[PDB]
Structures are given as C-alpha cells and as structure tokens.
Amino acid sequence: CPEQDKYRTITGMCNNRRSPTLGASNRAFVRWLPAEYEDGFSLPYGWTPGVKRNGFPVALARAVSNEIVRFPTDQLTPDQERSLMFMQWGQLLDHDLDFTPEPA
Amino acid sequence: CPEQDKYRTITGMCNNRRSPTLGASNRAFVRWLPAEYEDGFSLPYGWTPGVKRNGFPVALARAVSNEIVRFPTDQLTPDQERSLMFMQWGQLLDHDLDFTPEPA
Amino acid sequence: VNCETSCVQQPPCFPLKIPPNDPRIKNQADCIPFFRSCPACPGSNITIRNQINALTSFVDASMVYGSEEPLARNLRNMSNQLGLLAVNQRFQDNGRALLPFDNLHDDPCLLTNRSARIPCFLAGDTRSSEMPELTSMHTLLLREHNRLATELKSLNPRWDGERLYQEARKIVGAMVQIITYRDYLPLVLGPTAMRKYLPTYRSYNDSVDPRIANVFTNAFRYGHTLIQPFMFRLDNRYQPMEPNPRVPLSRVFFASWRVVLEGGIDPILRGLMATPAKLNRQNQIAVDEIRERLFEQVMRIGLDLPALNMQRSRDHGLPGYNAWRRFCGLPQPETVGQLGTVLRNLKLARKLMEQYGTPNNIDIWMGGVSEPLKRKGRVGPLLACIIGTQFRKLRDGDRFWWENEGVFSMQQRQALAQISLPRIICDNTGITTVSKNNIFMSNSYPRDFVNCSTLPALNLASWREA
Amino acid sequence: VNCETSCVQQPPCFPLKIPPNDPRIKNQADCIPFFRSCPACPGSNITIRNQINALTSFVDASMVYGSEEPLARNLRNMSNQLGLLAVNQRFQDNGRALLPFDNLHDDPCLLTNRSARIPCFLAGDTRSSEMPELTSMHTLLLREHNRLATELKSLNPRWDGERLYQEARKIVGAMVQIITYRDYLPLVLGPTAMRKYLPTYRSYNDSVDPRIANVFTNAFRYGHTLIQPFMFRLDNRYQPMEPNPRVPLSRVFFASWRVVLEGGIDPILRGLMATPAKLNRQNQIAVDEIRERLFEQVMRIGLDLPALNMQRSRDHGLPGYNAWRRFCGLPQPETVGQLGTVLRNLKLARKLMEQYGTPNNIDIWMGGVSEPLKRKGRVGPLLACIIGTQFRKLRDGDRFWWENEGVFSMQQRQALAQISLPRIICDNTGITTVSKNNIFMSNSYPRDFVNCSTLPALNLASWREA
C-alpha cells in the first residue's frame, strides 16, 4: 500500500492500511457467528434426505413461503409514510454493498 | 451427530452440536482480529526487501532477541514461589490445546 | 448438472423441492433453480465453507464505478480529458444520457421482448437492468457524475480527466453516503435503533472491521417486503402515463427495452416518488409478483424470491433465528407461546412452529421479517440490530467516510450537507416537480411535492483550486 | 530444497535473517531455519491466509489419547479387553511402563545419542519427546490411565475394553481440567485476572466458541520465560542424582535415551517438584539454552526460540502490540514515555522503540512478556487477557466439561474434587515423598514436601455400576 494516496482505489484495497483487503472486492465475507452446515463444514441443511437440524425436520423453503409469505394481493397495504423510492434506494444501496457470485 | 453420547469423540467433532467442527482437530484457528500480511492476504512482514510495516522497518526477530531477550545466565532469578513443575504443566497443557502443522 | 434445466441435486446445484399441493407447481418432480454461491476455498476438507463478496463493502458508489479495475476503466470515457463516464452511443432519453449496453453471452434482457432487441445495460454492478426502476437510479447517478465533472472543469481548468473523474466520483460517493445515513437508514431503523446502533460519528477508527457480514447479505433482503406488484409510470402532471401506467413486475424484470423505448427514466422516477411503498405486515409479507413469478420471462420457470432467500441462508451456513437473537442480546423464545409474545402474534408463531418445530431453526430472513416493526421504522429488533451493526462498521471503518477529518474541507462539508436525492433528480432529468424532503417518506402528489426552483443546487465553489 | 539445510527464502520457507555483527552467526547471509505454518487454504488468491490446529482445542487429554482416529486406535492395547493404552515392549522403568516407541522417518531422538539408538516416543501428541521432563508427564498420565482402567475393571467385571478405556479416559481428561483450572491458571493469571476472565462456572453455553485463537498459540508461549537452562534430576532423598544431576537443556531436547537409559521418570519428576522455575524479569526474559542453542544436537545450527516466536507471529499475520492492547480494552502507548509508564520500565521501553520504532509494531510475544507481572501471577495485563479469555471459552464451550450436568454424577464430582498431581505421582512412580499442594508453588525440599501416605487415593466407589 502507498504511504500516501488521494482517493479510493477501485477495489477498496488499502482503505485499511494494517489489513489492506478489508472491505476490498473478491474476498470472503466476515462471519459474525460460527457457520451451521449439515455436515459441520460444507453441506446445506436440507441437502440429505432425512437429516434433521437441531432435532427437527428441515422445512422446504418453498413450503415456508407457501404457508407464511403467500397472501392475496387485494389485501396489500400501501405504506402511507414511505414512498416506493424507499424500496428502490434499498436495492441500489445493497448493490453498492454486496454481490455473492455463483457459477454459470 | 448422534442424539445422545456418553463420551467425547477422539477428533472433538460433535462437542458443539449446531457447529460440530468447533474445537475439532485439523480445522483453522479462529482469529480474534483481522490478519496483517505484507500484501494483505499471505506474505509475512519481513518477506520483501524494503517493505515497511506501518511506516517503520520490520525488526529482525533475531535482532530483537539479541538486544532485548539476551541476558547473562548467572543473573537468572529462581522463582521463590513457583516450581519448575509450573513450567512443565504449561507445556504439557499447551500440547493438549494446539499444534500448528508445518511441511516436512 | 445444469442447475437451470435440471432438478438433480448435485454440485453446484441445490434446487428447491416442491411440496405436495403447491399452489403453482403441481408437478413435484419439478423444482425452483438454485446455484450454490461460490465457496471462498473450493474443494477443501479443512476450511468451513464461506462465500465471496465481489464488491467493495464501503458506501463508495461502486455500483456506479465498478469494484474491479478492468470494469472501472471500461465504464469511463477515455476519448478525452473530461473525466466522464461512458454513455449509450445508440440511444438517448429525451437528449439525456443512457447507460452503455453490455455484451453478455446469454443476455436476459433480450428475452423480455424478442422484437425490441435491447440488451442489458453496462454499469459498475451487474444487476443494473434487473428492474427499470433500479436502472433509472443507476442512470440518474451516471448523469450526476458527468454533470459534476463538467462543472469542476469550469472551476478548475488545469484538472486533467483523471482528476475530474476522481473528484466527481468522490462527490457522488459522498452523496450516496449522505442520502443513506441522513435520510434512508433512520426510516429503516426507527429513532431508537438509529441512536443505539448509529451514535454520532466521531472519526475514522482503523480497528473497526468494514467487511460485509455474511448474515447481512440475507438480512438486508428485508426490502423484498417493500416491493409493490407493479412498476408505476406517471407523466409531467403525475397522472398515469398511458398506454401502460402500471406494468406487472413479472414483465419488467431485465426489461431494459422499457427504459429505451417507453419514455426513458423520468416516468419511472415520478412513479417512485408519488407511489407508496408496500407495507410489511405479518400476514402480508411479500407479493406473488416476486413469490410466484420472479424472472418468469427470462427462464424456464418463475422463481420464488422469499423461498430463494431461505435456501440461500442455508447455502451460506447461517445460524437460525434464536442464534441471531442471542448475538443481538435479544431474548430467545423456545415455546410457541414465547415466540407469540416476541412477535406480538400467536397466529404467526404457530405457523412458524408448524414449519420449523422450534424458533432455533427459523431461517434468518423469515424470522427477521416476521418481527413487528419498530416505531417509525420498517424492521423489527433483530433486523435492526443486524442492519444497524453493519452500517456503523461501514461508517466508522472507512478511511474515506465523508466526515472523516482530511477527506473534505469544512466548507466542502458544509456544501455537501445541502445535497438531496430530490435535487439530484432536478439536476439530471426533465422532471421539474419532485418530492419534499424526506423523499423516502413523501409519497403523495401534490401534497408532498415542491418545485425544483426552491431547492438550492450543490455549490462547488469550495472545490476551486485557485 | 529444505528449510533446515538452506537459507533460500522460497515456499515453504521463511528463514530468519541474521543481523549485522551477530554474536553467534558470523556470516550475515546465512539464517535461522523456519518453515511457514501450513495454510488452511493452500495456494488461494481469495482467502486471507490462516493456519491449522491439528489438535482438539478442548482440555480433554488429547496429548495422551490422540486427536485423530487411526492414531487413537494405535495408542491402545487391542490384544485384550482391559481398555489399556499400549506400553513399550522393549523397556521398562524399574518395573513401570514407558511410552511405546514411534516410527519416524527422520527420527530426531536418534541424533541426540547416536550409539544408544533410542527413537522418539509415540504419544497422543507428536512432541512428547521434545524434553525428558515433558516425556515424564506423558508417561505419568499413561500409567494413570492404565491404573484407572485396572481399578474400574475390578469394580465392574462385566465392563468390556471399550467401556474401560472410555471411563478411564474420561477420568484422566477431568484430572487435567481440575489441575489446570484449580491449581495452574490462578498462579498464571493472578487473583484479579482470575476473577475477571474466569468467573464461577454456571453452565455449558453452546454459543461459546471453544476454538483456539491464532494469537493464543503465540501468547501462551509466555512459558518460555519460565524455562531453566538445565534438566535437574534428584534421587530417592531429593539430593543430586550422580553423575549428571544438572544436564544443560541443549543436550536434553529429543533425548528419549535419557528416560530409557538414565534412570526413568522418577529422578526427572523429583527435579521438577523441588527446583524453582525461572522468574521472568524485564532484563532476564529467556535463557541462551533456548535462545542460542535450541535443538543444537538435531539441527545444523542452534535455533533461537524467542526469535522463532516472533517470526511465527509474522508468519501467522498477527497484529502488533497496540492492536492486542486495544482488543483487550487496555490503553495503547504511542510514545516511548507512555510505553515506559505501561511497562513501569522506561529503559525497556527505550530498548523496544529502538528495535521496533513504534509500539504498534512490537510483536505480541515480545510486548506481552515485557509487561510487569500481575500480583501473584506470572503474566502482565495483555497476556492475562488473551490467556484468560481463551480458557473461559475452553471451559464454557465444552459440552464435556467435568462440572457440566450430565457428565459426571454429583458423587463422582465429589470424588474428582479430591484429585491432585502429587497423588497421581504417588500412584504411578517409585516416589514416596511429593510436594504439598499447590504443587506449582511448592519448590523446596524438605519444607514443601510430605509423605505420599498422608494423601488419600481417588475414591472410585461411585463408578460402580449398580
């Protein structure tokens, strides 16, 4: 890292001089808690037929969505004190913060 | 991980049921702070000629040992309140807790 | 295995299975496509799997400039010394700049209308075309950069293209920080959580880790609960702009042709300002436009965004609801009655217990968006904690935070304190009437609207090098 | 290649550079051998390099039983159903068991006395032969295991080999935890740091991460300052055991032949009990036996342990002194004057600034062992924080902690509360007079010693299966 600089680098490298990759692009996320995987280190819960999580069957994500998230659109409540721009800035900002790559 | 268990596994696996590799052998250390490497991710300070650490030259480990650690053996001070067994348990205990492998 | 065309569960696919009596997908042999996130250390039997952030975690407008050097270079106009970002060479929006098009091998935007042949846009982030409303925000910010570079060149004749680009990028980055912390986050967190997690800024602390936490990538998806089922487009009198003033969201995803051929970004920005967001309620969590018909036009089957969120938290090895509550110093309900008290809703607690068996296993997004919203906020205690904790780290751990001593002069900071999203819209569009501040609360035309002439533009005089 | 026979700085080596005018290594282009610790994710350009713990972090006597299944199985006597650990088949120590020999390809123990031909010992941990005093402790616990299994067999005739092994192993692990937390840690930390970092145990907490922290591997090396330059051996009456009662440490490293051919473990254990540890003082940090001549008989030149610790902290990417002070909530000295106040020694503070330039760069081991010792402790505030913090996690995050409900019964816990190291010595050696508790404080014969016959044996009645 340069002793002195004038602007941000494009990758975010060197923002933190003691640990120059912190906040830089293409680096592993930090974890605030130990990860929880089916096998302890790699497989997602729900991966292996019949393997429970912490004593209970893993619920299909689509089943949880169907039973708890789904609602009749005619009940929609417009937020009287938020604009749709409130939603939009959130997505835009999220796209300033993180993108988690996947294989093609 | 089994539902019930009377004894520890040999590897330490399954001691923590939600994250079964915690404390288990042949796993990465946990870090309490972000790592500090010359290039940010791998090279140790002192690796590349002329690369300072936070504005100052990297002190040779052998230079610090010679100038600060070295002392005349006849000046050794016996601890009136600790046995050498206190030293030895420390090493024995250390060998219950950590071994950092290296290539042969 | 091709995760897009196969339902076989083999690396790197983790297709979502279909339950009996599904309301849409009657064939249980089908599935909702899902590719596991790339692991930081492929094929390791030593490391605990973690995922990768391809972007800079800092609030530095990297969605405009790019987070890698080859891209950041390609987004710039290198034909001259004006320090501008490249604009579309084929199209303009009523004489104004559009984003350049990208060159994708399997362009999804082309699939949203075969006849129009309008590809996805090229931006600092790969998702700029995902919905026209997002595209309009990327386009708005591209224009503001070029406008600032142009004004800076007038004030400082000796500044080369690189100097102009960097000073404009620096102002735009400060603008995203100011709009986010001054206007947006207080309305997400509410006053109590805002004071707790984001106390008054002091200065840069190099011991504050600024990385995005893996949980935040899922928790910040709380915004999926604010999504309306339509894209609303309004004319200059904020009245429905025919022919289609209300397009179903399942027909706007990756629909870059709508920006180019259906009136540009002005109708879209007016619709964003004059239409209410959707309110998150406990039995009105997320709309079927994203739950049943996500990306319907650009692939074999419509996806379920809420379901993908939960599959993603499992892919990412994220702890359950109670582990996150504990992390946040919040009580952890163990029984359906305790969960009912925490949620102030026994009916939802019972739905959750029927699904998960225990609050320990509730997926973080589901548990987080299930909590009652904090007063004057749009998230509950858990999400407030995860989101507020993340943004304090991005602020305090950024050497280039706009208020950090040395980044801007006192007069430049005084000048930047006058910026606003409504003013930026005024400076870069044909829109002459915009929302009163706060733009994220104002939503009713004409009650909440003012003329652009009453909003003072950013004064760049303290940027004069003289 | 070889990091032991060359000074080329290339993977996997990171040779220690030699300063001008070194009092020992006169040729400045040469070096001290050093292999980089294995990375958790080899050859990656995404992950921040980290190192691996090959052992179980728990205080579970894995240095006796092994931390990998094939090894744990090989350490056991599988010729019968007695649940014993295997013992040496070639030699015995006055009728008592010795550790079996290992089968290494480049056995360092064979180099310490070429004509004796005694290889290294096989134990749960690979370093059991590093010094005969450590070997004696490993040998002691192996005998205690076999003694426990034998007693449990008499008590429970129907218990098979696996049950006997596991029950004895369980008791040995509990003994190591009790001696460590009841007797050892209080004398390391001092009473004040003991109460702060190790408050009364309340319950197993499954949200406490029990992993060893990277910094701990380097911070717990504070014990190198306790090392005496000789191995002391005493006879039946704690008088020097002729002809070599005081062997220089540089001639005992990997000297397994001394245990086998020079009188077994009894003279060594007595020497450890009736000899003072070295005191750490700011101008007497560590002896040349480990600073100039570490492993002199098995390497091309003598190594420097204090220097290796510092090169290791750099290999491991550990933050400097002030970052660890900050992590621990202790003031961070920025000037030589402030450092002089923190260390209560301006002279040492001046010495540290001349070498490092800034207290921000002082290596953790060096700054940690430089601090004045806490009252009735043998570490300063920084090391007390790191060590205390680690051992609380190893206690609170251990499902098999001896006091955790369900591990032992109330009456078994009452029995285990009577165990002590002096009694374990009495039970498995020809020593009939041992130190009074606390064994780590007692160090003078005959003042601090009592007959083994005054110490009641561990009562295993509550292990009888009714």
Ligand SMILES: *[C@@H]1O[C@H](CO[C@@H]2O[C@@H](C)[C@@H](O)[C@@H](O)[C@@H]2O)[C@@H](O[C@@H]2O[C@H](CO)[C@@H](O[C@@H]3O[C@H](CO[C@H]4O[C@H](CO)[C@@H](O)[C@H](O)[C@@H]4O)[C@@H](O)[C@H](O[C@H]4O[C@H](CO)[C@@H](O)[C@H](O)[C@@H]4O)[C@@H]3O)[C@H](O)[C@H]2NC(C)=O)[C@H](O)[C@H]1NC(C)=O
């Ligand atoms: C079981 O053990 C759990 C672990 O406890 C730790 O380790 C043991 C060995 C002890 O030493 C113990 O003292 C340690 O805490 C324990 O869970 C822990 O509980 C604490 C207290 O609730 C949690 O702290 C809170 O954290 C949140 C989230 O931020 C934290 O993480 C980020 C990311 O790393 C950091 O940057 C932050 O600094 C935090 O460390 C904070 O928001 C919260 O602070 C806010 O609220 C408090 C109180 O109002 C204010 O004083 C602050 O100023 C803030 O406004 C706390 O700091 C901790 O996250 C959690 N850890 C885990 C792993 O869950 C649990 O309570 C124990 N249970 C029992 C029965 O013993």
Ligand SMILES: *[C@@H]1O[C@H](CO[C@@H]2O[C@@H](C)[C@@H](O)[C@@H](O)[C@@H]2O)[C@@H](O[C@@H]2O[C@H](CO)[C@@H](O[C@@H]3O[C@H](CO[C@H]4O[C@H](CO)[C@@H](O)[C@H](O)[C@@H]4O)[C@@H](O)[C@H](O[C@H]4O[C@H](CO)[C@@H](O)[C@H](O)[C@@H]4O)[C@@H]3O)[C@H](O)[C@H]2NC(C)=O)[C@H](O)[C@H]1NC(C)=O
């Ligand atoms: C610059 O920022 C630093 C980071 O600050 C955090 O993030 C920012 C954004 C804020 O949210 C802030 O509130 C956060 O703390 C900051 O350094 C931090 O300072 C705190 C307070 O001194 C440190 O906490 C202490 O930690 C030690 C070590 O244990 C910790 O780590 C282990 C391992 O992960 C955990 O298991 C523990 O739970 C701890 O989290 C503790 O020993 C200590 O607690 C003990 O002492 C106190 C005081 O007597 C007692 O009340 C307790 O009961 C304990 O006995 C503290 O919890 C924190 O480690 C440190 N972080 C870093 C990265 O250094 C710094 O102060 C800021 N500087 C300025 C000028 O603002």
Ligand code: HEM
């Ligand atoms: C036009 C509105 C939005 C979408 C369309 C949309 C879509 C997604 C998709 C497809 C994902 C990935 C799902 C998966 O895991 O497979 C997704 C991820 C994230 N979002 Fe979404 N989103 C729209 C809108 C929002 C809003 C308003 C957000 C926040 C206020 C928001 C956030 C996020 C975040 C943080 C992610 C993860 C990003 C990453 O890759 O790290 N979204 N969204």
Ligand code: HEM
């Ligand atoms: C008989 C006394 C001791 C040694 C001989 C000895 C030697 C070492 C060596 C060679 C290392 C590695 C050096 C390097 O980094 O290249 C080492 C590491 C550790 N020690 Fe040492 N040690 C002796 C004695 C002690 C005592 C009394 C200790 C504790 C009270 C102690 C601790 C440690 C620790 C924790 C390590 C790191 C272990 C790991 O590999 O993770 N040592 N010591």
Ligand SMILES: *[C@@H]1O[C@H](CO)[C@@H](O)[C@H](O)[C@H]1NC(C)=O
């Ligand atoms: C670069 O800037 C000039 C002047 O504004 C403009 O005419 C040209 O179209 C721009 N080129 C690109 C690729 O954006």
Ligand SMILES: *[C@@H]1O[C@H](CO)[C@@H](O)[C@H](O)[C@H]1NC(C)=O
């Ligand atoms: C597709 O684009 C054309 C313009 O090329 C437009 O006229 C038409 O209405 C669009 N089709 C649909 C289905 O919207």
Ligand SMILES: *[C@@H]1O[C@H](CO)[C@@H](O)[C@H](O)[C@H]1NC(C)=O
């Ligand atoms: C196994 O146990 C028996 C009985 O104590 C003993 O004679 C034999 O030598 C032991 N074998 C090994 C390899 O330790």
Ligand SMILES: *[C@@H]1O[C@H](CO)[C@@H](O)[C@H](O)[C@H]1NC(C)=O
């Ligand atoms: C080496 O071992 C033999 C016993 O086999 C012993 O007589 C001799 O003294 C030892 N050598 C040294 C240098 O101590």
Ligand SMILES: [Ca+2]
């Ligand atoms: Ca960014």
Ligand SMILES: [Ca+2]
């Ligand atoms: Ca262990």
